[PDB]
Amino acid sequence: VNTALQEVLKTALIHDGLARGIREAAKALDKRQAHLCVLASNCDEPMYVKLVEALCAEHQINLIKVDDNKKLGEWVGLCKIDREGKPRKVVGCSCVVVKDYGKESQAKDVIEEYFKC
Amino acid sequence: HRIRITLTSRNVKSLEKVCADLIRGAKEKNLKVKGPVRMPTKTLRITTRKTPCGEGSKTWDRFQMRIHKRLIDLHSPSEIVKQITSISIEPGVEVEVTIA
Amino acid sequence: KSYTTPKKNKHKRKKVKLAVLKYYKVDENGKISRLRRECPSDECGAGVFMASHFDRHYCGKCCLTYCF
Amino acid sequence: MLMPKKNRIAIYELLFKEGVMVAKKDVHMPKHPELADKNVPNLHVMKAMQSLKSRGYVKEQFAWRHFYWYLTNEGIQYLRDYLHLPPEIVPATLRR
Amino acid sequence: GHQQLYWSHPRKFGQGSRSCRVCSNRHGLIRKYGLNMCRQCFRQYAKDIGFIKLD
Ligand SMILES: [Zn+2]
Question: Directed axis angle between helix D73-82 and helix D5-17, to 10°?
Answer: 140
Domain at A8, CATH number: 3.30.1330.30
- Cβ separation B63–E50 shorter than 8 A: no
- Cβ separation C32–A54 shorter than 8 A: yes
CATH superfamily label, B1-100: Ribosomal protein S10 (3.30.70.600)
Q: Mind giving me the DSSP string for chain A?
A: -HHHHHHHHHHHHHHT-SB-SSHHHHHHHHTT---EEEEESSSS-SSHHHHHHHHHTTSS---EEES-STTHHHHHTSS-SSTTS--S--------EE--S----SSHHHHHHHHH-
Contacts of E54 in chain B (CB under 8 A): 64, 66
DSSP B49: E
Residues followed by a break in chain E, C–N over 2.5 Å?
none
Give yes or no for a contact between D75 and D31, defined as CB atoms under 8 angstroms apart. no
Domain at E30, CATH number: 4.10.830.10
Domain around A54: 1-117
Domain boundaries, chain B: 1-100
Give yes or no for a contact between D75 and D91, defined as CB atoms under 8 angstroms apart. no
> Which residue type does B32 have?
K
Domain around E29: 3-55
Resolution of the structure, angstroms: 4.6
Residue of B nearest to E46 (CA): B63
Contacts of C47 in chain A (CB under 8 A): 23, 26-31
A29 — contact with chain C (CB < 8 Å)? yes
Chains C and A touch (3+ CB pairs under 8 A): yes
Taking the domain D1-96, which CATH number applies?
A: 1.10.10.10
Give yes or no for a contact between A61 and A34, defined as CB atoms under 8 angstroms apart. yes
What are chain C's partners, defined as 3 or more CB pairs within 8 angstroms?
Answer: A
- Give Cβ neighbours of residue A59 (< 8 Å, ≥ 6 apart): A34
Domain boundaries, chain D: 1-96
Number of compact structural domains in chain A:
1
Please state how this structure was obtained.
cryo-EM
